[PDB]
């Protein structure tokens, strides 16, 4: 069982066919650099017809004395590190500069060009502070906020985007705005949530491996890729930075008001944690590569801090709920073994991981410590971990789900989490919570977050981004990352214990 | 009491009252920022004497534009992140150019001038690309040692440095050069052993705290930090960057033949882990600030990665550590006395942490399976561990430095594995290892590490740093992270078995 929900998750965004049209894309045969592939802009952006280029030698196209170092780059195994190639298209006698942006994936050797003269700037000192003392401001944070507030605002800096923010995946892929910086030109998104399918999942795969991603202005015309004959099979366009966008998500971006954006990827122990993400309200942002890569960076060293800066938050307390369980054990020990056991030090127990009753059971004599479910009538509650194969810190809050007799049952307080003791699954300590009844702000109503076209409807994206309260009913407060490791420890500690049964 | 605290660890190396010469120390008051030390090489480096600026507010002395913004930084709680400060130094007509870079200490606010010569466009993208290819290149790294050989070829493409080693700490605090790149004329440290001695402890201890430093010549006449009447006690150069460092240290440099030095701390499970040790055999090299602090977030980066890389290695062999578990596991539980399940997989018992004895002691009681009894006086180890901090897994390269009575039997080097079961200081499984008698090549006589040259109550070091070689006995060939893991899953493992329980 993973998700697995909807057609969102479906379409094949790696393989458009298409390019944004600001920048050619060309792919080279190995080792002759030979056109096979060319996208259709090419007159406007080289002044080279797509079928004047399929078949010819890069070498052909270039000025005579940058042959050399370019052909040597695109020959080399050491290609993202080359990044950007200086090319120099000639055309009749002229000579039009490019940034070359080369790759190879899937065995195609892919040289994307874009243009690199009449741009704007680039101011040298900006870029310099951005790239220094946003690494400064990055190392020195002192928990999660400060680190995404540094990002953010770098990143602004760097890309004058109206708005950047960060953008953090949850255990069900919903994401929700936890840092911001915009200019006042625009609506705070910050603390707002969105739903997983706004990213759907074939999407975050593409985006655990190619890290960025730029769409410079949501108005353009895709740029077919031409193919040589017996090279129509299509071109994975996975790593090109042209790749055309889903035209689902371009729509979106319509309907949020916003007419460019950027987005790069954080990644925690390999898995997607977060964007940082970038739009512009009004107006385009065709980002050089040089910055974005300087986005790319600052994005890299926030993602090799993740987990250390939001560690932060609980090193105060943990040495606290550790020298807790410290007096837990030192009093198993010294005093019964485990009946009257963590029961005389309760919220010893219940401060451990922050709950309104505890409940043991070695074959006894429920113990409650109090208002559990029931007391009574959860007998139908000590058995779960014999359901599924875990052994196994079973820890919930929506009982909704898993055990949904909080529904034919309610009950109010469910919020469980229960650990077991001994092999063939009898003896539990369970720990459970009051409901916390809490308002999740979304933008846009996340029930109609996808809809239906036709005619056997397609797929389109939701029309309003309007705030919209969710009175969410279930859920208790959250089992922060101790209670399972603080249970883990308190269940190894009083094996311990209980194995002086022995006595 | 343990390791160690002799002659050498004394030197009160963070309070020399001096700095080196290339830079000015000064200290301002707070809040208003008058000058109460100053370092008496001013004259050369700023341009007035410390007889001037002792007495005077810092705002006399910079450049009447970028007055408030310095003063407003140096009076922020918050210093890391704004170094380095641009400090432009101002005597009647020249401005002198600095990088400031201040901190807090001891209740002083130290301000450390370096002469700081300025940043092109050409080469800093060459240097930001090189720091972000270098940080990713980490990231990437396949195991521990190709994350070792990744950070020294990075920080001496960084640096410049003819030679960048990582220097490893062992239990005792003797080091080792586990990696090295360099200069290929320059002669090899690598595989080269050193005493502890080298590196004596309050360094190793000032290094826990302050993680970079640079000598970037060891011929430096050392300049006096002058200070106003009623600040005279010794200033804390602990966290200063120009700190003058001990003399006995500069003259080891002298003896190794390096003429300028720069070393970063790394840092696993907050104990100093090692250096990367970067060294000149000729002329000097003073690294900006910018360059050093990307070299020690290379570091900082380095340490957060060490787990996880030694983590990845023996891939294969965790898999096979995990079935000899399971298989394991299975035949405790279906067994009379679970002991016996175990004694009866010398095969199954013995590859799962690769040693070639183990001895099995519960509720009695020692049944011993490999060729390694130690013979049955055997009663001696086991009754030793009877004592300790029996939990978890307790593990040695070399017996001999925990239990000196184990240099008696050549059959275990090592070391053990492992660990006690019931907590009572009563049972234990014990695995060993044969012993591989070795040579360790010291870099000069470690028995003359601490020379006395002349030499009565001061002290020297080497003169010679000729490889020394010297056969070890009672070292067995290391245990693998693996193996240590695996051991510590079989205990809780055991520990389930053992209290379930009747039938
Ligand atoms: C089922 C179809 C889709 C629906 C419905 C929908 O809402 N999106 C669908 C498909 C889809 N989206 C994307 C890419 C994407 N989406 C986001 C979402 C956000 N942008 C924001 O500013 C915020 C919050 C403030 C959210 C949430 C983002 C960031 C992206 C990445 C691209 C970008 O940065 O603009 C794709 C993939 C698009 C592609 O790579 O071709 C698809 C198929
Ligand atoms: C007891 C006195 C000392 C004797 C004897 C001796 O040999 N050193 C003594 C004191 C001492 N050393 C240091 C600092 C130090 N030492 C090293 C050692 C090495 N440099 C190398 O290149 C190698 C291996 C190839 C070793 C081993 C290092 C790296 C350092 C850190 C300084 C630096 O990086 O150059 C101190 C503290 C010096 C200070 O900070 O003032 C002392 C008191």
Chains 1, 2 share one sequence.
């Not at 909704?400 to 919020?415: D, T």
Request: with cysteine; proline share 5%; glycine share 8%.
């Amino acid at each position: 069982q993973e998700v697995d929900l909807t057609n969102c998750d479906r379409e094949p965004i790696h393989i458009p066919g298409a390019i944004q049209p600001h920048g050619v894309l060309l792919v080279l045969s190995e080792p002759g650099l030979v056109l096979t592939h060319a996208s259709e802009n090419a007159p406007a952006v080289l002044g080279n017809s797509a079928e004047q280029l399929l078949g010819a030698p890069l070498g052909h196209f270039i000025e005579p004395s940058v042959r050399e170092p370019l052909e040597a780059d695109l020959r080399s195994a050491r290609l993202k590190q080359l990044n950007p190639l200086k090319v120099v298209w000639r055309v009749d006698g002229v000579d039009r500069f490019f940034d070359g942006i080369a790759h190879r994936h899937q065995g195609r050797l892919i040289l994307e060009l874009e243009p690199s003269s009449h741009r704007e700037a680039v101011p040298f000192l900006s870029f310099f502070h951005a790239v220094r003392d946003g690494l400064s401001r990055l190392r020195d944070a002192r928990d999660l906020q400060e680190l995404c507030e540094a990002v953010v605002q770098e990143v602004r800096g760097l890309t004058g985007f109206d708005r950047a923010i960060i953008y953090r995946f949850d255990a069900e892929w919903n994401g929700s705005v936890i840092a911001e910086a915009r200019d006042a030109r625009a609506d705070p998104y910050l603390g707002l949530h969105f739903p997983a399918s706004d990213i759907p999942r074939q999407a975050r795969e593409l985006y655990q491996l190619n890290w960025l991603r730029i769409i410079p202005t949501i108005d353009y015309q895709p740029a077919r890729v031409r193919a040589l004959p017996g090279h129509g099979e299509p071109l994975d366009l996975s790593f090109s930075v042209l790749r055309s966008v889903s035209p689902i998500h371009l729509e979106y971006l319509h309907n949020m008001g916003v007419q460019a954006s950027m987005s790069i990827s954080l990644m925690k122990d390999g898995k997607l944690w977060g964007l940082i993400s970038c739009t512009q309200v009004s107006g385009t942002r065709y980002v050089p590569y040089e910055v974005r890569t300087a986005c790319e960076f600052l994005g890299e060293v926030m993602s090799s801090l993740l987990a250390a800066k939001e560690g932060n938050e609980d090193y105060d307390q943990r040495i606290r709920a550790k020298s807790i369980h410290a007096a837990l054990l030192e009093r198993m020990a010294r005093e019964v073994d485990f009946v009257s056991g963590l029961a005389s030090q309760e919220s010893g127990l219940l401060e451990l991981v922050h709950a309104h009753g505890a409940a043991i059971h070695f074959h006894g004599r429920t113990t409650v410590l109090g208002q559990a479910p029931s007391d009574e009538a959860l007998t139908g509650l000590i058995e779960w971990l014999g359901s599924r194969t875990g052994e196994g810190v079973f820890c919930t809050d929506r009982l909704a789900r898993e055990y949904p007799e909080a529904q034919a049952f309610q009950e109010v307080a469910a919020g469980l989490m229960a650990f077991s003791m001994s092999r063939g699954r009898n003896n539990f300590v369970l720990w459970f919570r009051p409901e916390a009844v809490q308002t999740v702000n979304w933008s846009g109503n996340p029930t109609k977050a996808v809809e239906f076209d036709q005619g056997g409807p397609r797929l389109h994206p939701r029309k309003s981004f309007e705030l919209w309260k969710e009175t969410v009913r279930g859920r208790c407060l959250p089992w922060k990352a101790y209670e399972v490791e603080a249970a883990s420890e308190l269940r190894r500690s009083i094996i311990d214990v209980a194995l002086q049964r022995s006595e």
